[model samples]
Target: TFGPVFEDQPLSVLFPEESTEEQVLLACRARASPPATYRWKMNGTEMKLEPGSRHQLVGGNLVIMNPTKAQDAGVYQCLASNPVGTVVSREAILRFGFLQEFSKEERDPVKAHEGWGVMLPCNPPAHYPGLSYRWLLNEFPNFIPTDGRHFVSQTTGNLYIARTNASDLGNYSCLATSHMDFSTKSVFSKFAQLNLAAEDTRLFAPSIKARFPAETYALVGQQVTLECFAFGNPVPRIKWRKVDGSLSPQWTTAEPTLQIPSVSFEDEGTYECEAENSKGRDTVQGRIIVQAQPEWLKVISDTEADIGSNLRWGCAAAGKPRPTVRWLRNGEPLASQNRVEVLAGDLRFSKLSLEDSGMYQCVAENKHGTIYASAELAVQALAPDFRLNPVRRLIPAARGGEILIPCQPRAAPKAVVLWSKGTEILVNSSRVTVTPDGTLIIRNISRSDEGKYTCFAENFMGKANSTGILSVRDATKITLAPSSADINLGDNLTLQCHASHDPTMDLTFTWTLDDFPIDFDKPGGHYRRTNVKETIGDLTILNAQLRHGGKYTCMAQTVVDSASKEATVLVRG
Candidate 1:
């Protein structure tokens, strides 16, 4: 339908107090379909324009080109029409006056219960000829209440609530207007806070306001207390009793809070508190457990068990409360599995093996404390046995050096270890010693050390031995063939030296010419050394002259020994 629709029915208008002979536009907007038009009126009279008039209508806005105080002050209206219907806007008044600063008293907060009546008063400004009043609660748009419980007087600025409720608690303000005609203006007073109290306390039962612990644990001879807080119109009384329908112990007090100066094991039980009044009664419960320190009554002792047999160890603990048992192996938590089981405060191994040979501990714990006992387990198995195959091995060493042979033995009783060579059992002396870990050491080794050495281990049940061959060699030796070389001037000459020894020994070679060590790094010299295998040395002279001839010696040295050899060469001028 082609009709005009305005979102707000009674439109609001605001204007400045004073103005010069200036122009101002009053604008209006509405939603409508096509062919909608707008018209303006003043004081119920149609407004039209004349030739070169001071008034003009532009885009649904009434523009007053030059407005005067007397002629422009009036109630203005806007009319919108279309094919379907026409709509009229609320009349808006245009006037001139400065908004005065206004304030109200800090009204006391109003408090009332349900089904109670309350009156909200407002002290407006000195009376006017025809004053209009309105009340506004919290939230805007429709400054009015839609509830039948609330009423507002138009003449007197007062709000009446038939029955005060929690919803009625909020900010409330009053609006005072002089006249709804040409001199329209409103003044709003400050808001006052409203509060509503709870229902009558006499109708409610006793309520526990404070919380309590579900359960409490305390050591023997320690002090403890349990509290209860209840509220009602008539003060409630608290009574403490045991869950077994017996009176509390003599150490407990008979107040809202129950205090125990010294708790004993006999005082452990569940306690309930009943808070009662004339209206009704309420109850709560808590558990108090008195405990004693845990002590070992019987503990495990060190013992030996045979392999492939069942083994068990007993453990018992004494405390106010029964203790729980746990097992530990080598300081680590141990749980029962296929071959192991924990039963009747004892640890049992269905089939014992070498893996079960270690330090075992029994731990018992209760609410009061914890206690533990430990013992060593030795499994009786075969003597020193090799986890891997042991055979004759080879070890190389230099003469006048040192060497160590390592051997690992697996046994239950921890077999004793010894060392022997060929047909002689070696004794611990200055040059030879055997380590407790089954390793043999020999110092200042010589050719006499070259033989098959054996690592021997023995226990009561059996014995085992493994052999290692030790080979010792001598130091490196250098030799140079004494020879004479004759070369003319401008000829190349070379002297040879040789080195022979064990290839594994690292050797350093040095040369001396005519009783003086020669450094090959000399600059701009007619002599240079020739390159060859490290075992073979060559001293070369370039552009040989009589001055280049000399006796050359080569020295070879290792960490163990040093040796030298000599060679001679002569050159012609």
Candidate 2:
């Protein structure tokens, strides 16, 4: 190995006056073989170059893209060595643009809804031209162009999110470099706000605990309305249901009201109200019951009677303990007097005559409750006398008819006034109406209006009866029956008299039962019978063995106070 070699060609190169920048490219073209190894130098220090981004030796060539004016533009040399000899290119005094003096900034934010997207602006301060760009995702140091959603656009150097969701938001930083004098970077904090909104409701019952058992039970036939409220983002829905498996109603607003009409036994149960809104929900409850009444009341006839037949009188009733029974005759509580025997029931009554046929009432009462009902008693006799007020009670108007009746003994209070035509009570048809003061008014009158009317007035002191005739011009059919009628002495029954005026006069008139010379109210139900407003008179057979048989009468009263002959109904044993 001959070690002694001569230094004929020195390794030194001249600088290119017009070199592009502080960086230069040492290049050469060889058609046949690979180029020789080249060494780069700075300021005469034997530079040991490694393979890196900052130092790149590309096939016998040198490249310096990051340019700087000061130290970066210094005298530089490249050495090419071969076994045959050693040569060096010219000294490349490079030049370039300004050194990039900028930084990379990090940006991210928080507090987000669950299902929406967010954007994090990875913004770095503006920089000079030729500055390379990069991002430090989750603090990773790498300039990658083909991974994840990371991308670089020449137009916008800053990072961007095409469509970011909750997951894409996190810690991030950006870096920009020139690879020459300054490499700058920046970091930022995290932030986000997801957009979500949901809702619900609540109900409350405040007065359910303070009710009494009996009071609560007594509340059963009564309806109670409940109050409740609802709240939510979209305004929640409300509804009600019963504990007894019944379908409840739905409410519309936050504050809804429930209505219950006619409460009864079957409706006794717990009630529930529910409310809901988009944000939440709630419910309320209530309870209810019902009460009962007493049984057994005494009821008797307030009328006169014949002899030898049992009389069914009414009785008064009480709740707590069953009360005792007693009979009364003409204001005297009867106890085995003459042929009078107290019946086995609570109702008290005795056999009657002209003496025992006036107002007979049975009294009954108990600790908790008391109730009584009464009937009228009367004896058969001659028809009473009745009359009209102004004679010749002619037609008052052009379209209808009018009859007037005036009674005698206008003494104490008013006497019972009744009217009857044949058998039916004089009633008003569709065009006929009777004022409460007893004035029969007929509208749109026609023919067939001819009939006899009996007006009878009676009280305890005595009784009176009278008659009148109704006349109508024109045409049509009109039929009249005793608006009320009586039967022979047997059992008490109701009798009806119907009058078909043109249209239909069902409510036009009313019925009253009466007998003459019988002070129904004078001596009570002890002597004779009293005038009753009932359409049917209760004719009894208490000891009435085939002797009390005669004409029982029903007298009708008209609105204009007109009266007619009594429509007498024959009674048989």
Candidate 3:
């Protein structure tokens, strides 16, 4: 068997302005025997694929029929996976690059004394990182070219005319152009009058902070404060207002801050703050995003269905930015296939079967937070039915520590939930009380409680229940952690991360360099997993490069607890 060891990995692409394409095509490809399956991560998060959505996958390439800034403007990474392993590619920044028009609000004429430094404040919205600034004169055809006397600061779009004379008195406007990936986008501000003033008169234009206010995100019902001030002669006046609508009565305007007590969805918008003076006016604007955590609007209820009948179960949630819904079976991602269709946060089974009867959970989530709702799917035939035992060891309570276990099983006609062990039924007391929702609370748990705990529910249809393995684990500790290393370039480097965990569990190993997830199948393909036992997770760098020099951290984790160790490396030529 003679085959090339090297493999072709997929990567994302960039689009320049002249490309002129409505559809955004991101090419990705990988070589494999069984053919590699590709998936894309938008801004480091796995994107869900929907049939109705414009985002579609053709072979391994990604195609967006209608690329929009709302959902498509962000970094993207391609991942190719097969039976062998998974490989991740570098990030590609993609966006619908454009410059916004200047505000249509009326502008006041700027005035300065003769032979005095003059400033024409310019505020034009532009996209991408940096911008090129220019001062327009007379009209669009006349560009006041820069010289020693006339200077335009690229950092700020302001134009400063030094030692002004009579000719300096004319119409002036600022021009802004975006520059990234050779993007071509430009916009001009409305012409503002600039006239000369008296020699004895001292007039300075308004100037605000060099950096614009960053976008702020606040939890719904949380407070938000925005500030803006201008430094100039005669003390500029500060004013704040909502860009599209009037301010709410709940808002309080302070000396330099606009404080919103409790922000809601209606409060989310672009806020403009203007600092005006007699000489000229300066303005800046920012956006506030009100974030709301996931909340269930309609939750799934416990029900019994027949085997040969079609069934549909759904859960709906509401949140700012619309929470994403996910379904799970026995704490695992529900498998989607031809027999079942997961649509609109609902499960539709064409023809139900006995194997489809299990514990089902609905998870609604957003960037803010997550909420969980669950119930059991019964094909009935429940002669004292029971579900599988779950790995209930996450955040394990230490010996002599307190812990709460959930029970609440789904039973028709309401169920009186009860808790029991192998041979004895647990009773409620001061330290062992059962919650009204059927959860068992145990304080000062001993090692003897490290076995199967069962919850049974009694209803009109009979008794139905489930079980969970409440495992007890010792605190994780690193045994052979890698430390600092000074290695020469072109030399192979090795790192070890060994830890002791619960004997019954398979410990997981995660590695990160400079706090970024380590991808062994990188573009250069220098890093590789070393030959070690399953418990002894180690990594090897085939050739050390200077870019690889950083803090490498190894995290040893179990279902319950995790421990980490870091080692700083220095690579020399």
Candidate 4:
């Protein structure tokens, strides 16, 4: 009996409140003798589950339905046991997400000087992982899309203005979001008006940060030295090597110097010093030619050949005495073996088979000295198989987002991977690419890409295909965000907002001023809002006053998304 070995294990997930599904799956698949029995644990405690089931196990996988904190949210693990032993899968976490409503306390308005920098905080309440941030202005806000002057911090939940001006005056608020698989939920922070605000270069890529003249000559038995230096932040690391070959590091110092004592022709060639760091690399190269001695003219290189194939590997050398070439298998002489021979300084194999694969060395020698090099010979062939790890039946992806689908198959004489959809072939384009390892990558997954995709792997032995189904969801966005405006006292001001989303869901409109809801019937009766087909909201303030000019926002929402836009109104006296 064998202990369970996992092919797939439970993965961490975010279960959204708005999700339509009744359950979440933690996939745990394994291989073992006697067909491993499955057990589960939550935060290290064995879960006592019954088949009647608030929690159920289908094979090694755990499925939790109608999950809640009381019964499901926490770290989960799976154990697959057989007669011999058991294997534990990595811990997978399950969490439901929500962005709590902002505090009821009113926030203080902020003031900043012109040409200065400013920061507006969200100070959001407790939430789950993966929180992103954006800033909004006026009663309605379609988050201020990124611009040169504005920046938002997802970690701190704050907004920063690079440089402030009169035009920058407005009610600014922040939105903290927790994204789901295909949808998202967000909460708006209390409005904080930015009454005013305002606001080099160091750390460069390593430059020459090196010696041995560009070209030079040296005699055997003499020492050689090379130097490389660079200037940069996080100081660069220097590495020296002899081009067309390598040098023994015994004389290589931690400093930039490449020092060699009693050097020989074997150390002759171009000496290259490379200085590298996270920023970049700087290379300095120099050449050194010593008087002739036995040196490599040809070295045995790594080789690959299929069974029943014929192969020839050559080793040659240059020297006055015409150094003789000999071959070795794993450091020993190539003894008389079937179908193998040596001739003209080369090794030949006939009807090559698996037994012929191994490390090979080339030894060249003369009266002056001897030199050697080695390489490996690999032999094999196999057709591609998608039986083990084929693409899943369906994958949910967000529109305009990125997705990666793996189609890794087992094969020898490595296969080439190609992708297609239906009868049409897919290739590298602005939005799609195939990685070397048979992964299909898509960027900005549009509605058109929501369909079955096939990854094809081909080798001389055979070809195989795996299909992955992609389903794209409509990504919520404000098609028409409210725009900033300047109004005169007593003049009617109107701001509009519209959204694009999955039509199947209901869309609602609401208006807010500086993070506070607008009351159209507030005795004075100045605020008036009307809907354009119910998908768009036109918030009009009749006989607008200076107080009403602070910031107006239009929040368009659906069960799946809370999208908003805002603008500032400057009413002149």
Candidate 5:
């Protein structure tokens, strides 16, 4: 024989097919050809021998020694292998019992008449001979199975009540055991009350115990139920009908609870329940009002408005009860203020501003339900007005000195400002700078830097401008005429006067001979005064004389002060 092959039969457990006991042995065997060796696996893992392990492999049998729930509950399998191949056996599952003890609150009351036999079941999942049962009466431990009218089953744990009477109207409890090798005591218990009534009781009229709301509201296509409870000596019979004599087709059952799978508008009306017996009939009525949620007919949409303009948002809804409208801005309640008004289901803004532009929610609420709509109120504006005007001031600078002329204006959306000297636009350079705030700066200022600077601000709306002046001046100084002017008698002589001043300032000039005024228009007007420019002048004498040669003085006056120069002309005879 070259190889050992397995047979058609699969290996599985031979003893204790199912176990509820915690400490019980479970054994498995395998059949194969050529005497193959055996190995055990549980839950898909190969079994290993360890110290104090609860399972062992003997010969061709797998033995679960001193098995407990933690060690034995799994799908056990046996593998048979030789030199040829390996084969896995069929699966054997070891399961433990789940014992759930019923509470007194969960047990339903059982009503039984006098002189009747009733069976109280223990209700265990599976049964065996080793299992035990015991009973208790009214919280007492005295219970005998064959005692007169009571019989209790030892195997099934069932209590039987025979020939019941009013005296048997007490609580009955059952205790059972799992019959495990580790613990044989009862693992679960349950109790219930027996309500026994006499056979010949006097009849009584039906009395209402409980009922649903007298006036109930339900939405359309919603599931609803109307319930009523009544008691009588003969066990009242319950019947449901509409306010009219006919029964509603929407109701499917006539039990104590009237079930309506889906309520509709047609189901709205008064419903009455009649509890009747041999004594008398008791009836109670309830009203069912079917309502529908609010539906939007017209809602507010995103809108835009300009500053100082009016804006209105309309909202309307339909519902069972008239819905009231309210407005919200940015998820918060909007109150009626000086410029905001709520009128006729519409929100009105007398004057819209940038602050009024945001998310607006319109809520329509009714007794039935509430519905809402939202819109973005985009309030646009063209606020190109100047918040601050450019200031105009006189700026003074000396020659070769730097100067800054400020003309700042504030406007919305920013305005393009330009600085100009008269009509010429001033550009930025190494020596000149124009800031966005309409401030002009001049470096190395000279006489050309003295002029009126205008700042023009322009935007989408319109334009505005302001002007200021720059004054450039030099230090006061006196320059005397040439050392001496050589002139002959009877020859005309001329002397010049010059003074440096701020280009934007005015000056006055005069001439004197030896501290005496030179009268240009006296008698024949011998002396002549000629004007060159604002700061330069000349004094002329038609004929030279010794008096005119003594000393010639020229004076220049300005706001900062005056400048004077003198010269001596020698006339030869």
Candidate 6:
């Protein structure tokens, strides 16, 4: 081999000793066996030759100077090749900004989830403007879409994520495209991603049996029956009636169906099917009760009432089966009332409310024809009507007991019973239970469980309330000996206090001998002292001394309240 025929010679770039604001230090050179092209690289990128770049050739030597931040750092390499051979210089690490280069960003928390959308916010470089940004994941990168909707533009770039599921969590980075053009561009900033989770929404309703139109409708004069069936957590009641005109009193009512012995053309008209339960009521249009022509039948109702309250309304009519049973209002066929409830009973309006007061009418109809009777309805004010049965009378506190409040009118607007200490809502816990029978039981009655309890029954018609008072006794009562007897000095006597209730009252025993109340918290006490306490009760006084003799009261107390016992001892010198 003729060794390698080379082009130019070895060349290199160097930085000056000191760089001034107006001057940059740099150096460059060439190789004899030239590479296909000669490039002066700054950092990892090749620099385009510029006129002001201090590079020149002195005979066989290529040289450069005035390198700036760009040219001041990185490995400078020289590659040379002949038709026979080529060589390259070893990479060099130029520590240019050793004291100046610092990491300007912080690491963020990594989050993991299945299908959620993550937000990554990138802050641009503080020193530079016009930074071109690039996003990457695990070194592999895709250009963030610039389409209109997804990426919103903020003065400082920001991202908005919508409908995040488990799938969209990951690490992300933003690389700003930087280049040394006439205007130096900025490097991309760091990336940050936030954690997210899946969200859902739904509506709930109780399922019920499907309803049909004709099953709840019927004709007149001939035998006809109607049934309204529905199912739910709490079963509801089904009732049938004429939708528009008066109802014939001849209609017979069964458990869940309305039946008429015969049907006639006169029986054709609009009818309705009503279904109800403790929750509420739903009425649907049923059959048509029409007529060939006789006396046009009509139905009248005043309103329903609360149980224990007086309600007076009547339904009267003349139709096929004598139409003897007639629906009457207070004195008429029907009365108008905003608060009137018309669904308590079949033939008569029951439990009439205060608002159901007005003129009421009666409806009459028969096979031969139809007629009407009229009346008026009036309701009376109700008192707190409730009874504490089984228990002879209100007992004292500390007595375990159960009380029942019956649920009446058992329909929509069901009754609710509540136990309140004054006005505190009684919560059912290990000690308290409310049964389906509306009875509230306090297994171990305490002073706290005493007071007035109210049972409230309410619905669309109105609300009825009743209250009962629970008389409670002193939780713990203690009696002491020697209340009237006197004991001499040095006499040993036992003073004891008996508790009426169990230890659940959290009773603590203390004895105070002063004529007035003594402080229990004081130390070295002649008073407010205790002797012995067992699982059953407490006793005070280790030994009877002259100083210990006097009227002494042994007290049992807890945070709830207190009770005490008294004894008198006299001291003799």
| Candidate whose TM-score is highest | 5
lDDT of 4 by residue, 436-511 (tens): 8778888887878878788889987899988888878776678988889898989987788887777766778878
Candidate with best lDDT:
4
lDDT of each: 0.68, 0.42, 0.70, 0.73, 0.65, 0.45
Which scores better on lDDT, 3 or 4? 4
- For candidate 1, lDDT tens digit of each residue in 1-573? 334545433233433444333666677665765745778778877788665888786757777766655678777777666554445554566654433434644567777666455667766766433456677776433365744445555435566654555666666887777553235667777877777777653355766544357778877778776666555445566678889556545755545657778787667888788878788999988888777777888898767776657877899888878888777664356787777788748888888877776656677887665555656576778767665745338777667766777767766455677778887888888999887877778889887788888878887778998888777876566555546766787788776767776777776767788778877787867656666676776777787776767777777666656667776776653
Off by over 4 Å in 4: 1-3, 196-573
For each candidate, give its TM-score against the true structure. 0.29, 0.21, 0.35, 0.34, 0.35, 0.21
Cα shift from native, residue 262, model 4 (Å) = 44
Model 4 residue 110 lDDT? 79
Who is ahead in TM-score, 2 or 3? 3
Looking at model 1, the pairs that clash are none
Error of 3 at 186 (Å): 1.9
Residue 98 miss distance in model 2 (angstroms): 99
- Tens-place lDDT per residue, model 6, 1-573, is 221223333222233223333332222233323333334444546545556656543332335555455645555543333332233332334433211122466867655332322345555444332334455443345545443212322223334332234434445555554332233332444555656544533222222233335532333445554544443324345566766666777763523445567776556777776656565677766564433322434444333345435444434333334444433342223333443444322333344445544444334445544333332233444333334322223434455444343434343323454445466776778887766546666667666666666655444555555566666654555544325355565554555565554555566665567645545555654333334454234333434566665676666666545667677766664
Worst 10 residues of 6 by lDDT: 202-211
State residue 7's C-alpha deviation in candidate 5, in Å: 67
User: Which parts of model 5 have CA positions greater than 4 angstroms off?
Assistant: 1-192, 195-197, 201-205, 232-237, 244-247, 277-279, 320-322, 366-370, 382-573
For all candidates, what are the clash counts?
0, 113, 0, 28, 0, 96
Q: Where in model 1 is the C-alpha error above 4 Å?
A: 1-231, 234-361, 368-380, 387-392, 475-532, 535-573
Residue 56's lDDT in candidate 2: 71
